[PDB]
Each structure stands twice: as C-alpha cells, then as structure tokens.
Design a protein around this nucleic acid. Structure first.
Length: 49
RNA sequence: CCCUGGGGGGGCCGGGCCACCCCUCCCACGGCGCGACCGCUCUCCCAGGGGGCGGGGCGGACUGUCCCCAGUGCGCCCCG
C-alpha cells in the first residue's frame, strides 16, 4: 500500500576536503633536486669531518 | 582660304565628363605612431655568477639518506 520511496531533503552540508590532490609537475620536479642536494651534503661534510 | 567647270583644306553651336592647375567627402590597400579590449606569459628586472614577475594576506596543500630550516604549487583580492 505504499511503495513510492520519498527522498530526504538531503542538502544539509557544504563541506569538501578529505583526500590529497595530485601534486603538480613543478612540485615533484623540485622534490627531486631537493633530494639530490640532500644526498651530496651527506657525503661532502659527513665523510670529511 | 588656296591651287588649276575641277581639285585641296579650315570651320559653323550648345552640353557634360574618365579627366587637364587651387579648396572637399567615402571606401580599399600598405607603413609609422595611439587608445581601449581580449589572449599568452615572463624578458629588460631584482636580491660577473645567484634568484623571479614581484608584494601582501584570507589561506591551504605539501616537499627534504633529514642545511629544521630552507624550498614548491594552487584559489582569491589588488598593482607591474
């Protein structure tokens, strides 16, 4: 006698961020040289002193 | 009018113009400057080589055999 399935008013939010965005090309390119610089100080100063 | 019935020339009078020298419109095409709009972006620029569009925040998300202090994007607001 009642199959019609009314729906909730459902609005109730304006909230959005839960997972990371895809990091940019220049951000992952400068991460590489920030690793390359951090390896060479480990051999320059920490094998000489 | 000329030359010997005949021969050789000039014309007749009004109009405009592709146009002929001086003042005036519109289109097309080219060049040199100009204003404003839209689009792309960092050069002169700045702290010989060094760093760049810089400048701030509302800010946020990050990055690193760990200079934990330095470094990279993004959205907005506003100038170059």
């Amino acid at each position: 006698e009642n199959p019609v399935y009314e729906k909730k008013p459902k609005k109730e939010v304006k909230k959005k961020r839960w997972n990371r965005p895809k990091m940019s090309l220049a951000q992952k390119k400068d991460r590489v040289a920030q690793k390359k610089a951090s390896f060479l100080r480990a051999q320059e100063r920490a094998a000489e002193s």
